Design a protein around this nucleic acid. Sequence first.
RNA 1: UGGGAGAGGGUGGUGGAAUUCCCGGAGUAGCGGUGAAAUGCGCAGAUACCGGGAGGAACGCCGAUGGCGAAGGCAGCCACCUGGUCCACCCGUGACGCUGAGGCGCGAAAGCGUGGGGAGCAAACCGGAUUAGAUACCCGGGUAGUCCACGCCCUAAACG
RNA 2: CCGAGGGUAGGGCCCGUGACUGGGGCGAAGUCGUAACAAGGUAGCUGUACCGGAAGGUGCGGCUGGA
RNA 3: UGGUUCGUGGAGCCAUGGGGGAAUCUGGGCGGACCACCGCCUAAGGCUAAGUACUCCGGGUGACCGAUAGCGCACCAGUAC
RNA 4: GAGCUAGCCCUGGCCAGGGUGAAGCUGGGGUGAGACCCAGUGGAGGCCCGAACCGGUGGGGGAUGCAAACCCCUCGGAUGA
RNA 5: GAAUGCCGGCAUGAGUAACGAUAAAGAGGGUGAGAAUCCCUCUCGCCGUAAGCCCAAGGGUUCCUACGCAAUGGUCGUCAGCGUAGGGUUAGGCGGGACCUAAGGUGAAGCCGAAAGGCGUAGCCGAAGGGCAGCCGGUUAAUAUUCCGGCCCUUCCCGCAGGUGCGAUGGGGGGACGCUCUAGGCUAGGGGGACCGGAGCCAUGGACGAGCCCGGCCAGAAGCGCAGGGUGGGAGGUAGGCAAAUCCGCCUCCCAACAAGCUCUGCGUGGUGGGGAAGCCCGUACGGGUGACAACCCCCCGAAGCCAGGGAGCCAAGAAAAGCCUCUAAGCACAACCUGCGGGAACCCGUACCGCAAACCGACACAGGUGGGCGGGUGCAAGAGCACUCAGGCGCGCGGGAGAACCCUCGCCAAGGAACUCUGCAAGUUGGCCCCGUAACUUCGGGAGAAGGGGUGCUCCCUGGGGUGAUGAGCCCCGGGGAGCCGCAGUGAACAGGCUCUGGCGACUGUUUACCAAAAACACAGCUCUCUGCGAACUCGUAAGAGGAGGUAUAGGGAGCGACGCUUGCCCGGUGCCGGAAGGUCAAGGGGAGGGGUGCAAGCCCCGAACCGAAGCCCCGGUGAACGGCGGCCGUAACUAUAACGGUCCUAAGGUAGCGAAAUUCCUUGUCGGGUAAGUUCCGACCUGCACGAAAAGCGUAACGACCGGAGCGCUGUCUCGGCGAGGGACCCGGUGAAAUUGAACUGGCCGUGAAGAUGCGGCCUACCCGUGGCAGGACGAAAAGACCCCGUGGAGCUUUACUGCAGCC
RNA 6: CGAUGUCGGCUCGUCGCAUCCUGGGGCUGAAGAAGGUCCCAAGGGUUGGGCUGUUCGCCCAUUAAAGCGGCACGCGAGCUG
Lengths: 272, 49
Amino acid sequence: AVKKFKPYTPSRRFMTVADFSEITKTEPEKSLVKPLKKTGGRNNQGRITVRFRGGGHKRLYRIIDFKRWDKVGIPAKVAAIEYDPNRSARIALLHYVDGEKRYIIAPDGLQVGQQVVAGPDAPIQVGNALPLRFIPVGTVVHAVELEPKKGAKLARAAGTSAQIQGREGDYVILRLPSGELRKVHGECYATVGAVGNADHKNIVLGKAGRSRWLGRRPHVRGAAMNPVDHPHGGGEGRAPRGRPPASPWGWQTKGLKTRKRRKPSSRFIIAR
Amino acid sequence: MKRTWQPNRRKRAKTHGFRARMRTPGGRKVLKRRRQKGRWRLTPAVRKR
RNA sequence: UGGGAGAGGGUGGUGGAAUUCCCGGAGUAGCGGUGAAAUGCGCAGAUACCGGGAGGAACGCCGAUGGCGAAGGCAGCCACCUGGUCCACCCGUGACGCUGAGGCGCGAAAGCGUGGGGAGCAAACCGGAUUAGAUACCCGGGUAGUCCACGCCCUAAACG
RNA sequence: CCGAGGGUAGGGCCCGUGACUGGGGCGAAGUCGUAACAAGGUAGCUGUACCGGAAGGUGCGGCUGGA
RNA sequence: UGGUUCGUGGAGCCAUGGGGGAAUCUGGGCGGACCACCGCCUAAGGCUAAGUACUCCGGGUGACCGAUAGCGCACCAGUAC
RNA sequence: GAGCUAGCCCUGGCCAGGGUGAAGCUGGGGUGAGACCCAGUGGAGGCCCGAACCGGUGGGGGAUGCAAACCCCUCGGAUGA
RNA sequence: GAAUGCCGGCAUGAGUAACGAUAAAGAGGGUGAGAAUCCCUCUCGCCGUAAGCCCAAGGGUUCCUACGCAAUGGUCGUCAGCGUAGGGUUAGGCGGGACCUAAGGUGAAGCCGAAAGGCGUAGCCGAAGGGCAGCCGGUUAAUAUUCCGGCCCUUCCCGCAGGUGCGAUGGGGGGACGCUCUAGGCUAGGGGGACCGGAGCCAUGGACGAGCCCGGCCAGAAGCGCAGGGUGGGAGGUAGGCAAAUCCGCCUCCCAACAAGCUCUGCGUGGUGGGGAAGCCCGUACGGGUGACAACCCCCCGAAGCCAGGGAGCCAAGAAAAGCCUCUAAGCACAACCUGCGGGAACCCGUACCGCAAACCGACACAGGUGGGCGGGUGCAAGAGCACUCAGGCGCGCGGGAGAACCCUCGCCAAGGAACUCUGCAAGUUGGCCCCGUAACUUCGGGAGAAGGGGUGCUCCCUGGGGUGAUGAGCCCCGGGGAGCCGCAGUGAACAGGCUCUGGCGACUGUUUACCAAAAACACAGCUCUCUGCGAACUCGUAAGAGGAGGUAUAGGGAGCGACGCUUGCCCGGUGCCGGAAGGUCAAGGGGAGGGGUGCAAGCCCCGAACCGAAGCCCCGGUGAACGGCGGCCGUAACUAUAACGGUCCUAAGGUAGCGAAAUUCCUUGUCGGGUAAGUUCCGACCUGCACGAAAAGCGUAACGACCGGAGCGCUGUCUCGGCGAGGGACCCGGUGAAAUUGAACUGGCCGUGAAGAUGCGGCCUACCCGUGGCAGGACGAAAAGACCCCGUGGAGCUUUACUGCAGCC
RNA sequence: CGAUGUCGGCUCGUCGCAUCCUGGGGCUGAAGAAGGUCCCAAGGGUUGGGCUGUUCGCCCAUUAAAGCGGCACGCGAGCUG
Ligand SMILES: [Mg+2]
Ligand SMILES: [Mg+2]
Ligand SMILES: [Mg+2]
Ligand SMILES: [Mg+2]
Ligand SMILES: [Mg+2]
Ligand SMILES: [Mg+2]
Ligand SMILES: [Mg+2]
Ligand SMILES: [Mg+2]
Ligand SMILES: [Mg+2]
Ligand SMILES: [Mg+2]
Ligand SMILES: [Mg+2]
Ligand SMILES: [Mg+2]
Ligand SMILES: [Mg+2]
Ligand SMILES: [Mg+2]
Ligand SMILES: [Mg+2]
Ligand SMILES: [Mg+2]
Ligand SMILES: [Mg+2]
Ligand SMILES: [Mg+2]
Ligand SMILES: [Mg+2]
Ligand SMILES: [Mg+2]
Ligand SMILES: [Mg+2]
Ligand SMILES: [Mg+2]
Ligand SMILES: [Mg+2]
Ligand SMILES: [Mg+2]
Ligand SMILES: [Mg+2]
Ligand SMILES: [Mg+2]
Ligand SMILES: [Mg+2]
Ligand SMILES: [Mg+2]
Ligand SMILES: [Mg+2]
Ligand SMILES: [Mg+2]
Ligand SMILES: [Mg+2]
Ligand SMILES: [Mg+2]
Ligand SMILES: [Mg+2]
Ligand SMILES: [Mg+2]
Ligand SMILES: [Mg+2]
Ligand SMILES: [Mg+2]
Ligand SMILES: [Mg+2]
Ligand SMILES: [Mg+2]
Ligand SMILES: [Mg+2]
Ligand SMILES: [Mg+2]
Ligand SMILES: [Mg+2]
Ligand SMILES: [Mg+2]
Ligand SMILES: [Mg+2]
Ligand SMILES: [Mg+2]
Ligand SMILES: [Mg+2]
Ligand SMILES: [Mg+2]
Ligand SMILES: [Mg+2]
Ligand SMILES: [Mg+2]
Ligand SMILES: [Mg+2]
Ligand SMILES: [Mg+2]
Ligand SMILES: [Mg+2]
Ligand SMILES: [Mg+2]
Ligand SMILES: [Mg+2]
Ligand SMILES: [Mg+2]
Ligand SMILES: [Mg+2]
Ligand SMILES: [Mg+2]
Ligand SMILES: [Mg+2]
Ligand SMILES: [Mg+2]
Ligand SMILES: [Mg+2]
Ligand SMILES: [Mg+2]
Ligand SMILES: [Mg+2]
Ligand SMILES: [Mg+2]
Ligand SMILES: [Mg+2]
Ligand SMILES: [Mg+2]
Ligand SMILES: [Mg+2]
Ligand SMILES: [Mg+2]
Ligand SMILES: [Mg+2]
Ligand SMILES: [Mg+2]
Ligand SMILES: [Mg+2]
Ligand SMILES: [Mg+2]
Ligand SMILES: [Mg+2]
Ligand SMILES: [Mg+2]
Ligand SMILES: [Mg+2]
Ligand SMILES: [Mg+2]
Ligand SMILES: [Mg+2]
Ligand SMILES: [Mg+2]
Ligand SMILES: [Mg+2]
Ligand SMILES: [Mg+2]
Ligand SMILES: [Mg+2]
Ligand SMILES: [Mg+2]
Ligand SMILES: [Mg+2]
Ligand SMILES: [Mg+2]
Ligand SMILES: [Mg+2]
Ligand SMILES: [Mg+2]
Ligand SMILES: [Mg+2]
Ligand SMILES: [Mg+2]
Ligand SMILES: [Mg+2]
Ligand SMILES: [Mg+2]
Ligand SMILES: [Mg+2]
Ligand SMILES: [Mg+2]
Ligand SMILES: [Mg+2]
Ligand SMILES: [Mg+2]
Ligand SMILES: [Mg+2]
Ligand SMILES: [Mg+2]
Ligand SMILES: [Mg+2]
Ligand SMILES: [Mg+2]
Ligand SMILES: [Mg+2]
Ligand SMILES: [Mg+2]
Ligand SMILES: [Mg+2]
Ligand SMILES: [Mg+2]
Ligand SMILES: [Mg+2]
Ligand SMILES: [Mg+2]
Ligand SMILES: [Mg+2]
Ligand SMILES: [Mg+2]
Ligand SMILES: [Mg+2]
Ligand SMILES: [Mg+2]
Ligand SMILES: [Mg+2]
Ligand SMILES: [Mg+2]
Ligand SMILES: [Mg+2]
Ligand SMILES: [Mg+2]
Ligand SMILES: [Mg+2]
Ligand SMILES: [Mg+2]
Ligand SMILES: [Mg+2]
Ligand SMILES: [Mg+2]
Ligand SMILES: [Mg+2]
Ligand SMILES: [Mg+2]
Ligand SMILES: [Mg+2]
Ligand SMILES: [Mg+2]
Ligand SMILES: [Mg+2]
Ligand SMILES: [Mg+2]
Ligand SMILES: [Mg+2]
Ligand SMILES: [Mg+2]
Ligand SMILES: [Mg+2]
Ligand SMILES: [Mg+2]
Ligand SMILES: [Mg+2]
Ligand SMILES: [Mg+2]
Ligand SMILES: [Mg+2]
Ligand SMILES: [Mg+2]
Ligand SMILES: [Mg+2]
Ligand SMILES: [Mg+2]
Ligand SMILES: [Mg+2]
Ligand SMILES: [Mg+2]
Ligand SMILES: [Mg+2]
């Protein structure tokens, strides 16, 4: 839906906030299962190695369930859907009859009170997790494992999915959010449905501060700098570059393919 | 204005203390040099309890 | 009350033909195209043929000089949801009617905003011919658009 | 107190005028090309969109005021 | 590749990171590419005094200084600052 | 050497008093149901005026200074990047 | 004898500048060898969201007392933060430690690195954060939540007495958390009182009065009372909480849904304990006594603080661990733990003093810098603002005169008002609150405090709402109406916008060259391109490892543009990038035709042509929100003029829209028009664009600005054109007393001359010796071994299709 | 070049005369008035504004006239910037 504001201030006239109506009466989270201390820090042991990180709201990590094959066969009741500061998506709090409480990343269409479960069994319904094999060709799916028993790694961003395209002996072909065509092992779990919160892309930050709230420090142009700092630094009053556009570290930034060629992963990929 | 000396006992101790110098080869040599020199004070005297 | 025809509308789903691209096989010296050509594609293996895969859009025959809607307009198939309408019986109400300034809704195509999609077609645009010259007609490419959702736009030989 | 009117400050409507600019009308015999009327030598007209010295061209759907 | 006077030189010898990879006296290395001959050594395990270097420390001496010299310091100096 | 300065991390603190009045609620109006319109309530914002605080705009002074960046007048931000 | 030499000494400037905020001093009396400067008393002034109190950091004897004045004190000094000595800092409850964890540090397991060493889940360390039991008074010259007095608590250990399956570093609960806005009830704090308590006081015309002045409190166990916070109680089932649980979780039935009940705080009350003014009298360097059997009561305002884990909203979604509760495991159930009561035990370190400053950071008794809490009263709409002033603390450690120039700061001005000037720079005008009233334009919010007005004091009369009290008196907050009074003037003092019109640039709030630039520069939301399928790309690192990210294409990196509106044309020949299992070229290696050296020979040792050999390059395509580029010359229309039209050369293609004398226009003050009496600027046009142009974006845009330009109104000492006055300096006297500079000097003008700008040389002219206040023409004055220029086979930072390498990638 | 601060403005002047005005004079194609031109003469005088950093210049309104030049394109230990 997206919340919109009137221009009672500049920067309030474009600003735009998510709709939280799917956030069920459960705004503060769940101890026990999560949260952990989350360790803010824009850099490695010592030095900054990703520029322009820092500031922005304190967070608690929700330790979510990315391998659903523990509770094969054990169903769970979806108890709530809550805000997760550390991902684009929303998260489902679910209660297993087992007693155990996990969070699943919350797919589009998930309703509270719903039944959900994981395993070879598993009715093909939104929320359920299955090894890729038993899932019908053509169904859209998410939180897909890359290699079996290694955890969900594909399609967890808000409003993303992959679609099952066909099969090939032990592998089923996937079409990933990027549009790539991937052979992913049959035995990999993946949960049916799309991610949801799909209006995430429609949000307009609206002002500088908002950027900072999310811990995004000001990014400065190479043009703004000096020859010591950047290939684009200097010279006089503005300058068009004077070389093929580059990163600060000298590599070209328009076109230069960067995936290493001899990756053994290659023989499992069929697209862009 | 604000000058450059902003005394802090803890800082002076953690920074220039006998135990800091002892911790690394760089520092151990400092004690060696100061000893051979005949320095009355190997490290700065940080006070208080 | 009881029936009947229909592409009337909305949503969800689904079927085959064909075009294009990808992959594999087989296969050669040309294919495309026009008034004639040229651009263009092709021994880096094209065209033509077989097999597999992908994707989008439009629904052949039935089909009519036919049906339906107030108009715009509506056509593969299926289910739901839904509007109008004609017949029969003459059963109920009992003049409850007709029209309609404004208002309000609807409203082809093109166009616009956001997001998606993109096979074929195709403004602009690039070439090749034609011409005195061609910013055209014809040919080879080709982007918006054409498709979908939501929101605008309110035009027409919106014509009987 | 009110009050003709004078003064100050800000608006509404109208008329005149203005370098320059837009198309329009009119002006017997100037230039460019040939769009329309015959099938006008690309049937025509059209709403819209883009493009072009110019008529105009083309995309899209529509009309018979064409076959 | 390093070492040697040896800077690729006709470049041996001595070490070695990489790849190939033997033999036990009629076995093996060397004598400056290489080969023949004549010779000299016996690798891939280790230890070994003395003769040599230095002067924190003690002593002796001086065509060494004599408080701006001589050690930074003749003096409670690596101190005051 | 980050006891100055720059950035980030952990953990605390600080921001007088006033304005303006967003959404959303509630009542009424309107419709077939709506949109929407009036109030009233509400208390939003890198919103406004202005101390503390953080600055450093213009001018004057100072120039072996009170000061190796100062003073006076003026001015910017002041619930936020 | 020179090195802007080095070290030391002493001069010159010179009794010169200065003596560190313009908050301010005067007198009397002491003391003393010696007083503007020390003590006392009186009068005067300054601070009072401090210039007063309390912490923290830092400092480290500066504290208190006695005796001192050589030096330190910008003077003096009998004084002191100084010299000598002596004394002073008292804790189970305050802070830190025998508690806990954060970032980070360290680090057994383990991983890595020539060595040194670098990583590293557990653990450990690590704190103004979590946890944890003392409040009020009194005494010292100097300590006190530490000593003493009262009242009240906390653990441990041993006893008894009574309970219970007790029992872990293990399980679970809790602890446990944001921002803004807030309700109820309290307390701190404050105001008033005809009431209570007090020494006193009637002054100078009046006042013996419900008169003036001062004060009417603090702490406090149990129990109560009043607020409020936490919390459901059963019984089954159980496969999860990494062993086990009766606990917790998840189902399922019952009764609660209430805070009823349990607890837990806060606040009142509370046995008892303590404080208790002015004034008057005393001797202090200060406190003591009396007032006193002091009284200790009633109303009102009232928190940002308490109840606290309160409520509501919102998006950016808001520490951990232990104490504590609970559950069970080993074990042990003569153990142990729980409750009550007794007795005993309770360590280590800090505690003085300064603490917005003379004791800390600034070489100084330095006008600078320094985190937290209390910060009274009155008035001005409010407030931590502003003026005055409680408590309290000060008069800033040179003074005395004088009343010049000149400077600083400040006050006023006839007439004129920007004529000033690069510029209204500066200064003025305006100024708070209430009430009318507000334009273009606009993104519908704004523009708006637009502009422009009126009101503002005091007295009396009537009157409407609340709040606390009971539905009333009072006390306190907001209002309305009517008469009237005074002055030049009523936010009568202090604090408090000048306004408009129109351009440029940037959307906006923000950021920046600490110490000459705050901007049109950076950033910014937003747009696009490109990479990256996850052990991702990229970044740091030799590595290990780490960030990215405990993220996964709606995500992450790189680049450019930079809200928003309308848009972003053509050129792929060159460079880049992307795509091309063909071809040419291409290294080690494979391959050995053939040839060489030695041997009597088997042999050993060399070169060595075919041919097979990657990436790269060549070559073929693609790609501009990739690097970039986007023409010349002739002719032509029935007045001239111009050229829709045509011809021709060249290019990879020959700038489209939109804009244009511009932040871009050389010629240029282009030319018209507008503003002016007059306009190289400004605004609007034209287009001949030296040398705009579409994401180093093009053209626009409301709002916004200590940005830059032009105009007008208002107002003025900016100016015509000055004048007067004030204080701080300057001047004189007493005290203390620098500086850069300095070849030595007995240091005049003119005209010449001289290395070409003479006090010093020639000639002439003038001129008794020595000072003081002033002015700045000269001493090519001082100051910095010119920073421009050039030189040196000097040096650095930067770039690239300069050379040569290296990391890195292939 | 072990430093001679560089345009313009302001303040303060002072000097040259090849004189802008004012005084004297000759020639005039000098009727008068008013000019032209040359000689003598520097004693005094030589205005306020618009534009521009400007010097200079171009304008507005006046004037007896709106003079030229030197003094380190006079004058920054006098100011501005
Ligand atoms: Mg936790
Ligand atoms: Mg480290
Ligand atoms: Mg940027
Ligand atoms: Mg720069
Ligand atoms: Mg560079
Ligand atoms: Mg440039
Ligand atoms: Mg550049
Ligand atoms: Mg009937
Ligand atoms: Mg329509
Ligand atoms: Mg359409
Ligand atoms: Mg978008
Ligand atoms: Mg086509
Ligand atoms: Mg075509
Ligand atoms: Mg019709
Ligand atoms: Mg007009
Ligand atoms: Mg006209
Ligand atoms: Mg025709
Ligand atoms: Mg035709
Ligand atoms: Mg035609
Ligand atoms: Mg066309
Ligand atoms: Mg058309
Ligand atoms: Mg060598
Ligand atoms: Mg050998
Ligand atoms: Mg030998
Ligand atoms: Mg030999
Ligand atoms: Mg030998
Ligand atoms: Mg010596
Ligand atoms: Mg001697
Ligand atoms: Mg010495
Ligand atoms: Mg409202
Ligand atoms: Mg507010
Ligand atoms: Mg604000
Ligand atoms: Mg403000
Ligand atoms: Mg000499
Ligand atoms: Mg000396
Ligand atoms: Mg003197
Ligand atoms: Mg003097
Ligand atoms: Mg003096
Ligand atoms: Mg003083
Ligand atoms: Mg005063
Ligand atoms: Mg005062
Ligand atoms: Mg001492
Ligand atoms: Mg003392
Ligand atoms: Mg004494
Ligand atoms: Mg003295
Ligand atoms: Mg002093
Ligand atoms: Mg004495
Ligand atoms: Mg003393
Ligand atoms: Mg102990
Ligand atoms: Mg500890
Ligand atoms: Mg610990
Ligand atoms: Mg840790
Ligand atoms: Mg650790
Ligand atoms: Mg370590
Ligand atoms: Mg603590
Ligand atoms: Mg304690
Ligand atoms: Mg004391
Ligand atoms: Mg138990
Ligand atoms: Mg426990
Ligand atoms: Mg626990
Ligand atoms: Mg009397
Ligand atoms: Mg009490
Ligand atoms: Mg268990
Ligand atoms: Mg007393
Ligand atoms: Mg709460
Ligand atoms: Mg622990
Ligand atoms: Mg103490
Ligand atoms: Mg103390
Ligand atoms: Mg303070
Ligand atoms: Mg002082
Ligand atoms: Mg000070
Ligand atoms: Mg401060
Ligand atoms: Mg207060
Ligand atoms: Mg006020
Ligand atoms: Mg004040
Ligand atoms: Mg005047
Ligand atoms: Mg006057
Ligand atoms: Mg005036
Ligand atoms: Mg002027
Ligand atoms: Mg002037
Ligand atoms: Mg101006
Ligand atoms: Mg001003
Ligand atoms: Mg502007
Ligand atoms: Mg800006
Ligand atoms: Mg700054
Ligand atoms: Mg600066
Ligand atoms: Mg500045
Ligand atoms: Mg600024
Ligand atoms: Mg690192
Ligand atoms: Mg990692
Ligand atoms: Mg991570
Ligand atoms: Mg990106
Ligand atoms: Mg830019
Ligand atoms: Mg920019
Ligand atoms: Mg721009
Ligand atoms: Mg372009
Ligand atoms: Mg090109
Ligand atoms: Mg290319
Ligand atoms: Mg090409
Ligand atoms: Mg390539
Ligand atoms: Mg190759
Ligand atoms: Mg122009
Ligand atoms: Mg230009
Ligand atoms: Mg004009
Ligand atoms: Mg003009
Ligand atoms: Mg440009
Ligand atoms: Mg560009
Ligand atoms: Mg700003
Ligand atoms: Mg302006
Ligand atoms: Mg004056
Ligand atoms: Mg005076
Ligand atoms: Mg004197
Ligand atoms: Mg003399
Ligand atoms: Mg001379
Ligand atoms: Mg002489
Ligand atoms: Mg002479
Ligand atoms: Mg002089
Ligand atoms: Mg001079
Ligand atoms: Mg020199
Ligand atoms: Mg230069
Ligand atoms: Mg050279
Ligand atoms: Mg020079
Ligand atoms: Mg000199
Ligand atoms: Mg000099
Ligand atoms: Mg003469
Ligand atoms: Mg004459
Ligand atoms: Mg000049
Ligand atoms: Mg002159
Ligand atoms: Mg000259
Ligand atoms: Mg000059
Ligand atoms: Mg001078
Ligand atoms: Mg000076
Ligand atoms: Mg300048």
